Ligand binder design. Structure first.
Ligand SMILES: NC(=O)[C@H](CCC(=O)O)NC(=O)[C@H](CCC(=O)O)NC(=O)CCc1cc(-c2ccccc2)no1
Ligand SMILES: [Ca+2]
Ligand SMILES: [Ca+2]
Ligand SMILES: [Ca+2]
Ligand SMILES: [Zn+2]
Ligand SMILES: [Zn+2]
Length: 159
């Protein structure tokens, strides 16, 4: 078992907003992505604008201060650190992608579900239908469901 948060109340903060989308839509995408994981665990997530957030949500490009640079449009879409202090748990999204609420560009909600998976301690799945499968695939957002494998994984960690 890899690192896990040692508490069930977890805060997040949106450090900055991509100009690709309206602010309200970014807030909504992120809130709904956390909700996907809270629905199958004892974890609760609260958004704060001030103070010490556990999970910082960041949009940045290229080399952005951690040792994992982004690569321009395409390729790496985002990445996240496992549970831990400071940069631990933080999720970074490549601003060189075009973030959307839909099937065009890269869907922020689906990507955030995957990255939050990592922020909570999950690794990759070999189930092509798992949200934790390594490669991005748009799926109908209104019918989205975690796979049984994603649920097994997160339930093995919490709690
Ligand atoms: N390789 C691809 O098909 C796309 C390319 C997207 C593009 O070119 O615009 N890139 C990616 O998929 C990059 C690949 C990183 C790597 O090179 O290993 N993946 C990543 O950056 C991982 C981030 C992520 C995965 C998902 C997801 C997974 C399952 C279901 C739904 C969503 N959502 O975000
Ligand atoms: Ca953190
Ligand atoms: Ca990229
Ligand atoms: Ca962008
Ligand atoms: Zn980063
Ligand atoms: Zn991943």
């Amino acid at each position: 078992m890899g690192p896990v948060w040692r508490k069930h109340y977890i805060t997040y903060r949106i450090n900055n907003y991509t100009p690709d989308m309206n602010r309200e839509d970014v807030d909504y995408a992120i809130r709904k992505a956390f909700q996907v994981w809270s629905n199958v665990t004892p974890l609760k997530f609260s958004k704060i604008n001030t103070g010490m957030a556990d999970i910082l949500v960041v949009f940045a490009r290229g080399a952005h201060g951690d040792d994992h640079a982004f690569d321009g449009k395409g390729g790496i879409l985002a990445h996240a650190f496992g549970p831990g202090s400071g940069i631990g748990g933080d999720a970074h999204f490549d601003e060189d992608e075009f973030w959307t609420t839909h099937s065009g560009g890269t869907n922020l909600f689906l990507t955030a579900v995957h990255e939050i998976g990592h922020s909570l301690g999950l690794g990759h799945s070999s189930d092509p239908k798992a949200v934790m499968f390594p490669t991005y695939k748009y799926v109908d957002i209104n019918t989205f469901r975690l796979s049984a494998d994603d649920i097994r994984g997160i339930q093995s960690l919490y709690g």
